[model samples]
Target: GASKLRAVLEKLKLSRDDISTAAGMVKGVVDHLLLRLKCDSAFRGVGLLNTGSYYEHVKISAPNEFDVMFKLEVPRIQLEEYSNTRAYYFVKFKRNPKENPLSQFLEGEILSASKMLSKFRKIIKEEINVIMKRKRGGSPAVTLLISEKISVDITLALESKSSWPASTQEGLRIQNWLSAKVRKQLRLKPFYLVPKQEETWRLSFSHIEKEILNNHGKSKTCCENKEEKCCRKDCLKLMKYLLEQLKERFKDKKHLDKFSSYHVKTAFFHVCTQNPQDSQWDRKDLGLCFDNCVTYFLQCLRTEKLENYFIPEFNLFSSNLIDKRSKEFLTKQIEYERNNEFPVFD
Candidate 1:
């Protein structure tokens, strides 16, 4: 009856319907402006987002549902092209409200924020490569500290690997192929490497914990064999217990307790209070925190994009002279931009 009634109504009052539509449109525009103002002023976290993730689903509530209205997940992508190969990178950003270490992170929000943050860090890495090419001439043959958070330190580490375990070798080969495709499409070189298991694991654990909620946990349980094992229910129960302890531990953690102290210097900031009890555990029993840190380290790196490229000024160059070709290239590059456009000499 409702459907049929609407059919007849559509033919009858076009003027009233138009007026109602206009009013709704007006309301929408006003709401949009208000929401935008709130978004800019209310939340300051960075995000790597797509149109559909938050933009399409965001709500406009006034004295409505939220004490604050803000987008929670944003995604960003980074692309790298090196030696005729291309690779894509994606990152997500989220907000981490002030946390009490003693309390479990507001799990859903914290995990979401951390995943996006780590993803953004990866994007920064890809962007760093691009910036290095632009700034230093060729792909940066080196990595430097681009920037860091007040409490966290992140820097890019670049190295050439020659050999790997059999399983690792197979994965690298596949990644090399995929990277080649991207490189061709982007007209760049092939530098996208399938990282070792440890690198890949670090980039993803934060998201997995939040989204998948799995019991897969691994540890250095044996003296010789560092194998991964499923913690099953044991992992979750342990995490819960850890959170409960951290809430109390925060009081003793120098960083948490002294977060607002103006006297703290950047060089000495990550000063966590030593956990006296942790000193007595055997290696196998004490490995969970270390493993998890290894897994989620990427989340700590999202903010500064150019930090991974700072080269320390060392006197080693005095002992080892640069090649003649490099010296000539630099001389020509600096001569004058007007007439010097020679192709790069490797």
Candidate 2:
């Protein structure tokens, strides 16, 4: 059975050439876009922040999808609660906002999310058109779609080195996994806010997420040493692969559409927090570790209670957000995969 599971991982692996080609193409696109952005005075401070599973090193299958943020440094700002959800905020400048180039998008105090996103979208569309035409039918987009496939999500994020938001006080349950001192060090780093709604900026801890996963070991040397290397990342890769495969097989079912790789990764983070030992996740026990995480996910679905790791109050599996029937469908699907040895992988 372990051999069979190993086969699944082997099949999921991305080839070296695939990584080289994909990363090269993605970098070219992002670099060209950033070069265009650099000429604009308002976006002179924009820098690329590569995120998601690919940058985190847990991505399985092809390196076809990516998440990148164009980071813009904003002046000292204040956050006002935009909703009861505590997941969104209205960002306002604390100092003289009239001095900043971003002042044009401001409505009185808070930065208007809708206007900024629309402006960013126009810039992206213009650059994409330019990039498409300059290549003269040999465009990267065509090359990617025809030979292989690639898609990158580019978003605008406001970067601030201000203290962590108040809502995050109850979250980041990593004291047991990583020391409280480590938490302090991470919190010292900048936090980013991206436009999500017309009036609200959604907070993102992506950099922090990448950091935790990259160094995700009960001990400092968990994955550093060859002989002592742990299987934490491998376990995450398997769970991500499982979700991606299931979503493809059930694409016609709208209920299943509610699921996301983020949900699985959040649960995986919790699993790590609960079982914070390299010895427990030995590379040899990859199969067992994967099943153990799947069980944790099923339990979350059954209870309809998967909390957003960064914002503990937000319930990802809330009955209101994902109806009971949808939850049941996913539970059954995951159970079927578990019981039948995941023919989906085949």
Candidate 3:
């Protein structure tokens, strides 16, 4: 029943007070560390940018995890596109009379992400040792375990108030769907380059993504409660839950672990692009809309192709990234759920 599905979704929604309190505590610790770092010679001009599901208002379950991008404004840096992907870049510090604080970590004009992240890990350890526990290697973000359930990924990023990378020039395919004005505004927003593995800077559009999600409706007041309501966020939450449940059920299979909530989020965005009308996602059609979104995701998985919303060249699902068995398993599981009206959500 639609009512049952709504009840299940409502169970996934975190309390507003709970989310606010946890975010407050998390921000307090982060702010303290950044404030101290700003005074340090090696970490000047440090700023905090809140991103991810929590800030995006699509967070489900405990609301414990958070993503905070620690930004440093680089005035005289040059960015070279690493490849055709347009997501990765090599940051080089150009000629400057004054010494750049980050220059110490650079290996011959190329900033070493591992070296810089290592310093950030040490700084966090020295200041917030009471709560933050470091998990190093492999991941881009310097992860800090705040509590038993709560953890934060503190990513190091360089701010650039310039044009986006060439790869992204044709990306963010929301123009025809979201309107020319919204697309233009999103394209004009400032971008960031995050330090990832292999000393590369990955393009980050967290702010633009957050804006698109917040104002998702075609109409101004789609979810205003005073007017018609849409199930955009609700549908995304349901898809996220479905993926999590599948992961648990197939924990023994290691390849299935490659699938993350990000795949679901990307699929949700594409589904939104396809079904742009507010009337199409009415609150009453939550179940139908969710089913359609799931079907879309399954199609992407079966084809082994889910493109990143911001960078279409970067495939979220490639044959090498996700094996055939895993894709088949996911398709079967989703098909089962669809056949049974999503008993997995129960």
Candidate 4:
């Protein structure tokens, strides 16, 4: 019976061939688009940052999706809380005369996210539409389909090294999972201000997540060799796959699309901190770790409350975001999968 789970896990990770093939096809287009954007004066300072599932090394299914974050450095910033949830903010330069790189996007004193993101998106459309195929027209993060299935999502973010906003006081519970020195070092690293709709910017800690996932262990070499491998990321891959499968199978169901990888990822981060230790996620304990994550998610569903891992107070499972009926439906679906040992994995 357990051997079946092994089969499932083996299929979830991309083969070396799949990785090489997809990389060869997608990189050329990405390079061309970046080159065009770099030639533009306004976006000359933009630097490419690879993020999302692919970069995290946890991507399941075909290696068909990628996220590239193009970051523009900004001077010291003052954040004005933009959304009711503290997760979003309006960017304002603390002090500037004429050297402000984003002067064209300012609305009075606040740097308007909508205008900057719009300008960024239009430029990409102008550049890509000439040589590539784009499925939709949208976002600071724009998407283009390669070979119809492989997709690259590019985002433009403002990089700021300012002290964190007041809203994140309750977030980043990694004091125990990570060392004191490491926490200070990570907090000092520049956090990317991701542009979203309504002139709001969401703080992106994708780099921090990358660091933790790469070296997530009680000891430095917990997963450094075959003898010391851990199944923590595998647990996430399976969970992601289960949700995607459920979403596809119930695509017609109303409000089903409301629940997303965001919920699962946030929940996953919390679980990692809650069970902060390497041995708990040993490769031999794959099913155990997966089961533990599902149980944590169940509690979140039962209460209909899942907080943003890095920004507290924002409930990801808020009633306004996901209707009560939809939450209940997702709860039941997950419960069924858990009971049946996740048939969706196949």
Candidate 5:
């Protein structure tokens, strides 16, 4: 059974050549687009940052999809948290009285996400023309469908060297694991506010998340090719693969659509918090650690309480978000895997 699971995982792992080709294509497209956007007066100082699963080293299957942020550095701005969510904010221009390029899209103090995105979309449309397909609203990132198989999510984020918002002060609870020095260094780095649905600014923690994953082990040498390996990343890859397979097999179920790789990723982060020791996730115990991660996720699904890792107040598996039947189905499916050594992959 371990052999079978390993075989499936190997199959799911992305090939180096595949990843290189995909990354090169994405970088070229994003570079060209960013250059074009920089030429525009409205988006003069736009910078590009590669993020998401690919950058996090959790990417699986074909490395076709990517997440890239085209960032705009704004002057001093104040943030007001939205009532319903800890992550969403309303940004008000605070310091500068000078002419603001983004001033036209602001509603009083709140910056208009839709208007800004609409402008960015126009820029992309003008440059890329036929390759760009504008997705319907609600997605925070403006998507460029380069082809049927390859696509890139171009997120427009406001980068501020200012202090992080109050809501995030208590979040990213990794000091116990990654040390105070590491945590301080990370927090001191610039934070980003990305445009989301309903004209709200959501704190973009992609860089922080990526950094944590890259330097996950308690020891300095963990996961290094020359050092002892750990199963933390491997376990995450398994969970992501399982979720993707589940989604594909149950595509007709709308509720299943609510459960994404992100939920799996959050659960994996929580697992790391709970079991911080390298011994707990040794390479030799990968199967056990993988099972434990899945069990944690299954328990969260059963309880209908998967909290966003960065924003603990947000329940990812709220009943209003996912139907009861979908939860039950996922629970049952995960249980089946646990009992059968994940026959779904086999």
Candidate 6:
């Protein structure tokens, strides 16, 4: 009921009644508008994500620490070493998968799917190196093929900028471009990887499950299923349409064949001109510009999508990157000024 949101508001010292009621009102309006959009149009050109969009999540398994002994693929199981495998999350609200009418819109023009995926590999690898530490000269390895699909519950929290509604415009454009490109690369009907989480109607799911549940609580829900609509058919249809357009535009099926046999992994990020309120902005978003690109390029191998992607390359990143208004707003947050305003850190 209203109890959950109310509890959160109180914890934050907000006027629970006013803020909670206001939140409900705002959500109600957003949902109504979203329904209108879904009914009225197909997602095309700009405003591709006018609410009710699917977003990607990363699932981290127990870390992967293996000893490259006498044989890379060896006979014995050694001590339980620890490392990490980054898995991609394909999610949609069980109630409204592909409810956004715009999702049905077509992308005209041609771009090579293989080229985009290759560059996406580079984007992620650059970002990963920035946050996830690594040994020198061991270019990170990525697994591009998946033996099986893995699922994890989405957790709700103060949504990070990395989640959505807050990513730069460039991030969204690349995501749209990649979704089309990836489907072409895979030849698996179709798929879309957007830049943020959709705010579930009424429930207002805000974070992936891990952020909300403690270690003791994680296992209990790990296997539990949360209801969400599956938009695979719709995704595939759009995928096919996009491929035809690509063929007309680029006239290159030979390049598309590169993704036929292997799997590909992709990652997302929000680029900010400066740091944002940690309480509001996901830290990773703040790290994506400038040198961080170099970092992710190195870390791409650690993601689970690589297991299926077969060949990882710097070319998967796209050329149509965008710039959004949030960057202008965030730029005002001077590291010294924003940091100094917080009393506890001092």
Q: Model 4: per-residue lDDT, tens digit, 155-218?
A: 7777887776667766788777766677777777777888653777888787777778787776
Q: Is candidate 4 or candidate 6 better by lDDT?
A: 4
Question: Model 1 misses residue 14 by how many Å?
Answer: 57
Q: Estimate each model's TM-score.
A: 0.19, 0.89, 0.91, 0.90, 0.91, 0.21
* TM-score pick, better of 3 and 6: 3
Models ranked on TM-score: 5, 3, 4, 2, 6, 1
Per-prediction tally of clashes: 31, 0, 0, 0, 0, 54
lDDT of 1 at 162: 23
List lDDT for all candidates, in order.
0.23, 0.75, 0.76, 0.73, 0.76, 0.23
Worst 10 residues of 3 by lDDT: 53-62
Model 5 agreement with the true structure over 1-346: per-residue lDDT tens digits = 3566677767765464344666667767777888898887768878875464233233365455666777798877888888768878888887467468778777877888888888888888888852765556446456766557666766788889988777666667777777778878888888888875266887777777678878899888888875578889878888988887777778876757777678888899999988988889887787889888998998998899987776778777888678789899889988887887676676
Q: Mind sharing the TM-score for model 3?
A: 0.91
Instruction: Residues 1-346, candidate 2: write the lDDT tens digits.
Output: 5677788767666463344566666677778878888777678888886564223232355566555567898867888887577778888886664678777788888788767765665676677752221232110112112134655556678898888888888788888888898888888988888775257887888778778877887688777778787778878877888888888788777878778778889999889888877888998988888888999999999999998787888888987679899999989999999999888778
Model 6 lDDT, full chain set: 0.23
Please give, for residues 1-346, the per-residue lDDT of candidate 1 as tens digits. Answer: 1232223234323433344332333234324433443343222332212212211211111111101111222222122222221121222113344332211313332222233334433444454431111233111112222122011112111111222112222221111222334323322211211221011211111111221222111222322333433222222232222223222344454322211111111101111111112222233332343223212221211211111101112111121223334333322332332132211100
True-structure lDDT of candidate 5: 0.76
Off by over 4 Å in 6: 1-11, 14-19, 43-192, 195-346
Q: Candidate 2: deviation at residue 322, Å?
A: 2.7
Those runs of model 2 whose alpha carbons end farther than 4 Å from true positions after fitting are: 14-19, 52-59, 130-148
Instruction: Give the CA lDDT, 0 to 100, for residue 140 in model 3.
Output: 47
Q: Supply candidate 6's per-residue lDDT for 259.
A: 22
**All models, RMSD in angstroms:** 26.8, 4.6, 2.4, 2.7, 2.4, 23.7
TM-score, predicted candidate 1 vs. hidden true structure: 0.19
